Design an enzyme around this catalytic site. Structure first.
Site, short mmCIF file in Angstrom:
data_model
loop_
_atom_site.label_atom_id
_atom_site.label_comp_id
_atom_site.label_asym_id
_atom_site.label_seq_id
_atom_site.Cartn_x
_atom_site.Cartn_y
_atom_site.Cartn_z
N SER A 1 0.81 -1.21 0.00
CA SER A 1 0.00 0.00 0.00
C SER A 1 0.85 1.27 0.00
O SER A 1 0.36 2.34 -0.34
CB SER A 1 -0.99 -0.02 1.17
OG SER A 1 -1.95 -1.05 0.96
B1 LIG Z 1 -2.33 -2.13 1.90
O1 LIG Z 1 -1.10 -2.55 2.47
O2 LIG Z 1 -3.13 -1.42 2.77
C1 LIG Z 1 -3.77 -2.24 3.73
C2 LIG Z 1 -3.49 -2.07 5.07
C3 LIG Z 1 -2.65 -0.85 5.51
O3 LIG Z 1 -2.92 0.25 4.95
O4 LIG Z 1 -1.87 -0.89 6.51
C4 LIG Z 1 -4.10 -2.91 5.98
C5 LIG Z 1 -4.90 -3.98 5.53
C6 LIG Z 1 -5.16 -4.20 4.18
C7 LIG Z 1 -4.58 -3.30 3.27
C8 LIG Z 1 -4.73 -3.36 1.70
C9 LIG Z 1 -3.28 -3.23 1.18
N1 LIG Z 1 -2.67 -4.58 1.42
C10 LIG Z 1 -3.28 -5.76 0.86
O5 LIG Z 1 -4.14 -5.74 0.08
C11 LIG Z 1 -2.58 -7.05 1.15
N2 LIG Z 1 -2.42 -7.78 -0.07
C12 LIG Z 1 -1.37 -8.72 -0.27
O6 LIG Z 1 -0.54 -9.01 0.52
N3 LIG Z 1 -1.38 -9.37 -1.56
C13 LIG Z 1 -0.28 -10.45 -1.90
C14 LIG Z 1 0.01 -10.60 -3.19
N4 LIG Z 1 -1.09 -10.37 -4.32
C15 LIG Z 1 -0.89 -10.89 -5.67
C16 LIG Z 1 0.35 -10.24 -6.27
C17 LIG Z 1 -2.11 -9.66 -3.95
O7 LIG Z 1 -2.96 -9.38 -4.71
C18 LIG Z 1 -2.24 -9.08 -2.52
O8 LIG Z 1 -3.12 -8.30 -2.37
C19 LIG Z 1 -3.23 -7.90 2.25
C20 LIG Z 1 -2.95 -7.54 3.58
C21 LIG Z 1 -3.48 -8.30 4.61
C22 LIG Z 1 -4.25 -9.40 4.28
P1 LIG Z 1 -4.89 -10.51 5.64
O9 LIG Z 1 -3.82 -11.57 5.81
O10 LIG Z 1 -5.21 -9.63 6.85
O11 LIG Z 1 -6.13 -11.16 5.03
C23 LIG Z 1 -4.48 -9.75 2.96
C24 LIG Z 1 -3.96 -9.01 1.92
#
Ligand SMILES: *[B@@]1([O])OC2=C(C([O])=O)[C]=[C][C]=C2[C][C]1[N]C(=O)[C]([N]C(=O)N1[C][C]N([C][C])C(=O)C1=O)C1=[C][C]=C(P([O])([O])=O)[C]=[C]1
Length: 324
Positions: free
Chosen positions: A61
């Protein structure tokens, strides 16, 4: 003589160690840059190699401000534009947010950290335009900082992007950079649209910045990034008493064996202050916190808060508003 400020270095070291201990994390790093020169004021890692320069992470992000900047800078998007932010498919891949909002404006996409909204902004551009912009921020480019073992990171040629990959790169996956490269990229926002070189030596000449976006765009993006640290944003833990802070949180599932795994994460927090006229960039990453929480806001936000707050105090920058 080094550009390093020993009092900032000490503060960063102590704060990083406190957070890595508390969160029982594997590793972490802090970089502090001068926002208008690119000089390194502090650079600290947990024991071992100089991960800040040697290791590449997916920014996650923490890339979203750049996608937003590119959109605004093109003239094709205004900050008040509203987007449909519902889950959607690319081929048979899904782009979706953690928390679903039907619509968000650009401020909302920043504040709430929307993958969907970010991907819609990037989809207005061609693979070549987005690649050229990431390249111009320094992704996949050698900094020539003077450190040995400095990674260039990873930016795959646009000539081999699938449509899903353009989307995922816009919200920070599939491209890689060091924490120092990521802090450097934020000079585009702090130095009125020009990318600065990074150096650990005291500067003798004004650095030559390279124009990536208009100064007016950089100003607007900095204003949008204050939403992240105010009520309603993902990054309120990084708010600093007496200042407005522009910041971006990043929480990534960890890329481990080609797999993205759901039980390991990397927390990133990057920002600058004072937001309107910034003096410093502070970037923090903590690898694999295990003590419960893993979101950027809880893991890295408090180290950002203490290091940014302490840094502004050390450099003798007066608060822009009354302390509370
Ligand atoms: B991003 O980092 O913003 C945030 C935040 C933040 O602002 O601190 C917190 C929670 C979610 C998000 C959305 C953004 N991060 C994600 O979407 C994360 N995504 C991924 O890690 N991945 C991995 C790889 N791929 C393919 C290349 C993806 O499409 C992807 O989206 C994220 C973060 C946490 C989770 P969890 O484990 O809590 O379900 C899942 C995905």
């Amino acid at each position: 003589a080094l550009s390093l400020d020993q009092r900032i270095q000490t503060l960063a070291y102590e704060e990083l160690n406190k957070a890595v201990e508390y969160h029982q994390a594997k590793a972490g790093t802090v970089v502090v840059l001068d926002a208008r020169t690119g000089e390194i004021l502090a650079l600290v890692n947990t024991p071992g190699r100089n991960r800040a320069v040697t290791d590449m992470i997916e920014p996650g992000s923490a890339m979203k401000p750049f996608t937003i900047a590119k959109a605004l800078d093109s003239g094709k998007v205004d900050a008040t534009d509203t987007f449909n932010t519902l889950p959607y498919k690319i081929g048979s891949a899904t782009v979706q947010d953690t928390h679903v909002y039907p619509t968000l404006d650009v401020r909302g996409i920043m504040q709430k950290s929307s993958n969907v909204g970010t991907s819609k902004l990037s989809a207005m551009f061609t693979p070549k335009e987005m690649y050229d912009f990431y390249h111009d921020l320094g992704v996949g480019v050698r900094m020539h900082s003077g450190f040995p073992g400095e990674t260039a990171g990873l930016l795959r040629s646009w000539r081999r992007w699938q449509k899903i990959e353009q989307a995922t790169m816009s919200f920070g996956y599939g491209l890689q950079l060091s924490l120092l490269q990521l802090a450097r990229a934020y000079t585009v926002l702090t130095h009125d649209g020009e990318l600065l070189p990074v150096s650990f030596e005291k500067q003798a000449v004004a650095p030559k910045g390279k124009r990536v976006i208009k100064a007016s765009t950089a100003k607007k993006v900095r204003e949008l990034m204050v939403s992240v640290t105010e009520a309603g944003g993902t990054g309120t833990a990084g708010a600093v008493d007496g200042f407005d802070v522009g910041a971006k949180t990043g929480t990534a599932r960890k890329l481990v064996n080609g797999r993205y795994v759901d039980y390991k994460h990397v927390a990133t927090f990057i920002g600058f202050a004072p937001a309107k006229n910034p003096r410093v960039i502070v970037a923090v990453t903590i690898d694999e916190p295990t003590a419960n929480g893993y979101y950027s806001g809880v893991v890295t936000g408090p180290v950002f808060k203490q290091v940014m707050g302490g840094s502004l105090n050390i450099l003798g920058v007066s608060p822009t508003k009354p302390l509370t």
